[PDB]
Design a protein around this ligand. Structure first.
Ligand SMILES: CNc1nc2c(CCNCC3CCCC3)c3nc(N)[nH]c(=O)c3cc2[nH]1
Ligand SMILES: CNc1nc2c(CCNCC3CCCC3)c3nc(N)[nH]c(=O)c3cc2[nH]1
Ligand SMILES: [Cl-]
Ligand SMILES: [Cl-]
Ligand SMILES: [Zn+2]
Ligand SMILES: [Zn+2]
Lengths: 370, 370
């Protein structure tokens, strides 16, 4: 039987790593892309389809689920895995990021955040409890994602609060025997774009001790150049022997560059959200299938993609479906986009394992941006 | 290799029949339920899923497809079968019924109907041509579905026009060698609720000669009692050795009673349309999954249904999905409802084959309306 949590690194190239996370509910191949759910579902896909694309783990949506149908109700029905029919690992975010981005009126304090549903409270203790009620396998500490840009003073005060909340998250998780024995807990580094604050945050998280370490506070408007600059110094501050999770990233080129900088795990709504809006990812860059140039194009979305959509249906058909507002259009676009992301991760893993990831990154960028 | 068209009756009980239609693209078990597409898709289902529910044939949507993406374009892309990925028989309606129900401004004449898209003309010749361009296997004659109620004079004039159009449909179909050799053509009986007009229409259609005969002009507001009364005298007027197709019907109890009256084929948007709106069919009658009573119900939609939805997911989960507006909710409701309809048809076929259909009908009604 698998352990509660074990991360093993099988091969390395520069800062990039490939390996596996073993958990009770399954193995996660890294670098990993984790598709993101909306309301106990990955949009427009059955769980068997999500698995068929190559996903080893998905994200649940703590913020949506605590409001509807409610975390207690999901627990009463047997937990999120049973409820939605996904029996493999699930990671849950801690909810505050989405509260601060989506909620109408927020009130923040040392205790947590109160907010009005689009009233509810969210504290480190309540966040960990909700994630337990959902039955999450990878639990995120409750943090504050500092807005960008932030002054050094405000970034420091925010990061300091997040580190106090990280300790409260650790203690809440450890107090609950079933959660501590069966799930894993990740800490989230903050500190905005400032190296000294990123270092203080990394040091605080390592002193507490976590199963994995996320880089928080990025993909919040700073742009790729700045994100990469912050990753350059921030990832080496985290424990080398634990997974590194870049939250909310990102486009294919963001993922490649982040792996070059030591990131092992990614989540992003982009492939699911933008597929419904007509954007399809291809090795030659994204296309918008709604464009009239595809109305009679009999080729698949991408000429090399191995997914079931590209084996069966044409650009012309999917163009028509999306233009007509048909549900099958969203289903096919979403399956292809998630499958494309998984094929990207597989090429990344294979190229690191073979010591040719730097060349893969160069070749990928030349063709994707040609 | 299968013939162009062969209908064989394997067993009979009273007016009910069970058997098969063999066509080049597959066998159709009768009595048959034919799921209805919207715009080159059966809503929210891949074709493989439609087939998995038990469907042997589906309906294309001539009215929608002639407007978008256009019949000529579909032909240029290889036909509707290739375009949507369904390789089995497709029946297409002739388009006038939907024009008269959906179009904003209509102008009717002996030549056909002109209308504005929500300008285009539709005549017997153009209707048959569009169905050819789509690559339909079962082509419907171009008719006029008389509004209900209709005076005897107006019903007669309308039926007479439909019979002239039926002859024009026959000749257009026969002129096109590839269509005549590979597809089948059905005539449509009209005459409103009037026995003498139904008889004149049946006689006119039999003189022309068709591969199958539809009962048109019903399910247009007359209610089940009146529909059944008209079927009682109308179905025996059609050739016994050809299939009898009741257009646009219907609810499960409508289907059972129509089979008792000699109907072999059915199409209806109800299972697809109403599933998206939360109505699920069960052997104990329909339920609305949005009702709060299902919020914590761990049972499947129906306790006996063999479909994949009822094997995996609970009422509580589907309730949540539909309340949340999630695409997966529509997917699961639609798959279950179409599968339920196919299981109904299978029970009908098996009970006729075993000489116990009358008992099945009685048992079905007692439980469905309990
Ligand atoms: C898109 N950019 C971005 N996302 C971030 C996220 C959310 C990652 N995605 C989670 C899913 C969203 C819907 C359900 C869960 C962040 N989350 C936390 N806790 N902290 C961040 O600093 C944090 C930072 C992030 N930046
Ligand atoms: C719902 N009631 C009803 N439908 C009838 C229909 C349409 C059957 N359904 C076809 C699908 C609808 C969307 C795409 C094809 C009828 N069609 C014709 N041609 N004539 C009728 O008298 C006729 C009569 C009908 N009565
Ligand atoms: Cl969340
Ligand atoms: Cl039509
Ligand atoms: Zn693909
Ligand atoms: Zn079912």
């Amino acid at each position: 039987d698998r352990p509660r949590f074990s991360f093993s690194i099988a091969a390395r190239e520069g800062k990039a790593r490939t390996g596996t996370i073993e958990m009770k509910r399954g193995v996660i191949r890294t670098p990993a892309f984790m598709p993101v759910g909306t309301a106990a579902t990955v949009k427009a896909l059955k769980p068997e389809t999500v698995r068929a694309t190559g996903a080893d783990i998905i994200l649940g949506n703590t913020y949506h689920l605590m409001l509807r149908p409610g975390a207690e109700r999901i627990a009463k029905l047997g937990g999120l895995h049973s409820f939605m029919g996904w029996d493999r690992p699930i990671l849950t975010d801690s909810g505050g990021y989405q509260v601060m981005s989506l909620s109408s009126l927020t009130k923040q304090s040392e205790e947590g955040v109160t907010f009005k549903s689009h009233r509810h409270m969210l504290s480190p203790e309540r966040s960990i409890e909700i994630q337990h009620l959902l039955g999450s396998d990878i639990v995120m500490a409750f943090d504050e994602c500092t807005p960008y840009p932030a002054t050094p003073s405000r970034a420091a005060s925010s990061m300091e609060r997040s580190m106090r909340w990280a300790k409260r998250s650790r203690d809440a998780f450890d107090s609950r025997k079933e959660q501590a024995e069966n799930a894993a807990l990740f800490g989230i580094q903050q500190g905005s774009v400032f190296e000294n604050l990123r270092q203080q945050s990394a040091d605080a998280l390592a002193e507490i001790g976590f199963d994995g370490y996320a880089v928080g506070g990025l993909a919040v408007g700073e742009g790729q150049d700045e994100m990469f600059r912050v990753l350059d110094f921030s990832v080496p501050m985290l424990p080398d022997d634990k997974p590194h999770y870049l939250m909310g990233v990102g486009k294919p080129d963001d993922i490649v560059g982040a792996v070059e900088r030591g990131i092992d795990m990614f989540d992003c709504v982009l492939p699911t959200r933008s597929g419904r809006n007509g954007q399809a990812f291809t090795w030659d860059g994204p296309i918008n299938i709604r464009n009239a140039r595809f109305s009679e194009d009999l080729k698949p979305l991408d000429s090399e993609c191995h997914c079931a959509v590209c084996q069966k249906w044409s650009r012309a058909y999917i163009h028509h479906l999306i233009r007509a507002g048909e549900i099958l259009g969203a289903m096919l676009m979403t399956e292809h986009n998630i499958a494309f992301y998984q094929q990207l991760m597989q090429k990344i893993r294979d190229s690191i394992s073979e010591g040719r990831f730097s060349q893969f990154a160069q070749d990928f960028r030349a063709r994707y941006f040609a």
